[PDB]
Amino acid sequence: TGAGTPSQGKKNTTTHTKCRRCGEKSYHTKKKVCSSCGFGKSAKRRDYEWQSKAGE
Amino acid sequence: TVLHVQEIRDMTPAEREAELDDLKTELLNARAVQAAGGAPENPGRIKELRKAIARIKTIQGEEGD
């Protein structure tokens, strides 16, 4: 069984969903954590300096 | 339009509420006739009713009812 096309047919699990806090489809319904804004993980909003060029 | 601010302030608290229910009913019937796709409409009033109700509500707050 190839890792490619044939293995793609087994994918019918819902993980990432519309996030209550930020509105992005990043709320992982299994972990109950938003990979985009951090909801469910932290009160503070998920943010990182590497999201932009260092001097900008 | 038809209803002015003066007229509203000149009404007693009970009159505003009565006028309120009356306006709401005209609106409800408008939306009903609109729901039935009715044509005997006058697009202006359906818009006027909303504002009139906002005016009365604003006045009721100002006066304390």
Place this chain on the structure above:
Amino acid sequence: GKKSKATKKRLAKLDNQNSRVPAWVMLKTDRRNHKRRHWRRNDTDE
């Protein structure tokens, strides 16, 4: 699947948005919905 009431509201909105730009807007602007979606070719969120 099983849709919650909120999911339902969202699907409903997406359906509504998925309509043509009214004919009269054409005239008024003297001459296209960029958010037109197809159930099959596209994929909504959630």
Place this chain on the structure above:
Amino acid sequence: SWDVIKHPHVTEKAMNDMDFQNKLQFAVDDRASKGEVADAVEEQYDVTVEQVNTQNTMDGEKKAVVRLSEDDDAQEVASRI
């Protein structure tokens, strides 16, 4: 403050319910319960509500099918709006 009854739902299927089952159909606030729909209707048209069935529609609104008592006549009630 949100009202209960939004507007009459007028469609062929609705007309039939009205002509054959003495039922009226309304678009109501999605937060309204079967009971709150029953009251609102009795207090707006002065009639006796016997049963209420609801449905959250794919149009984002809640639809109510309100059956009136035999003492009332839907056809006539709806005819005054």
Place this chain on the structure above:
Amino acid sequence: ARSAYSYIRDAWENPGDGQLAELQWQRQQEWRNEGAVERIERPTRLDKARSQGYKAKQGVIVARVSVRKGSARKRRHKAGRRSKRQGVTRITRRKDIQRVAEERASRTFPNLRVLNSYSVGQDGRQKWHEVILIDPNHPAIQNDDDLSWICADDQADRVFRGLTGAGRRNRGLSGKGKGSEKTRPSLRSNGGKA
């Protein structure tokens, strides 16, 4: 004549001798069974507390905090490092324990602001410090000529920015001349070389 306070002071110059020695031996047994931050109604070292600004008044709080003794509790590198950056054992943190103590105390009382702190001994595995905290929102303090200054907005969370007496010492701000070229006005403005 000598103040009664001078006696508390003099006793604490040698916490390992006399009555004090016996007191500590007794007290520590209880402290060891207490939490990380215990509010106390009265300073163990009155003279020291009053000297640092303590007052028997509403809005003035004292809490004892214990912290594990020793160097940095650091995790060894999980990626490539030149020999110089592979150390783990002899590496120590840049903030002294008294400072870590003041911060834990201040976290416990989010609405209060650190005024000062002092040492109350240690055993072989931990150190204890008492921290004086003030309520910037209480009128008895808002009206105090000696403490109201701590009610200003720019004093909020003062401990976390090193504005404490222990904070300023640890930042190398004691000296006004030689040796403070890289500490004043801040470690950061001086490129972090102090």
Place this chain on the structure above:
RNA sequence: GCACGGAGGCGAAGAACCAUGGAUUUCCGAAUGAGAAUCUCUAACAAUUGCUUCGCGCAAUGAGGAACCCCGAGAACUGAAACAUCUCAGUAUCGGGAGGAACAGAAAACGCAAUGUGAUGUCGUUAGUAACCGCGAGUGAACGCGAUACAGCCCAAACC
């Protein structure tokens, strides 16, 4: 309104429009009665604190903000024509935190050694100087001076 349509309406009861102030302001959201992919279940400052009439009665904290700022944690590619000290660099990145600016600040200073200067930032200079360094590559101040702006005070104790 964008938006140059159709219909209809509003405006001399002075509309539109602008300024200031006020009203309304769904749900989720620090999100705070409990739970939940923005909904649901049966009165709510949840949680941590201060005061306390010891009752959430009165209060505080939480999260956001372009960067700037303060306190902590802290690389490597790279340079040395290899490389380990050194360098890149206290840089990137991470944790915490304040403000409109931060931080510093009225000498247990300086040490043009003096019959002299007189809180502190910062700018120009002192200077790639002193100092560091497989004394290699490289790293690198300060006092002073010219400026900017200037401001000096409060406790602990003694005695009550």
Place this chain on the structure above:
RNA sequence: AUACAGGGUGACAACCCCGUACUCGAGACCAGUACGACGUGCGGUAGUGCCAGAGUAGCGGGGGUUGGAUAUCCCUCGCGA
């Protein structure tokens, strides 16, 4: 023309329109600052070992850091006026 900045208007516009010079008005910041006023009360002599901040000053072991070299700053363990 104290206005010949700029723009608009069916083509190269000081004089067609908006503006522009001059003069004037309001808000914000400077700033609850400066000045002014209220209260407080500066200072000096003689006598008096009454008072004046401790794990500190200082030393040693181990680290980091720094231009700091014997002579940087800091952490940690021990000792200590």
Place this chain on the structure above:
RNA sequence: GCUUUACUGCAGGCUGUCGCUGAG
């Protein structure tokens, strides 16, 4: 990437010592 009695270091284990730490 991997190896080892390559170079240099780092964890870790063993061991002495100091603190915790007292009385006869």
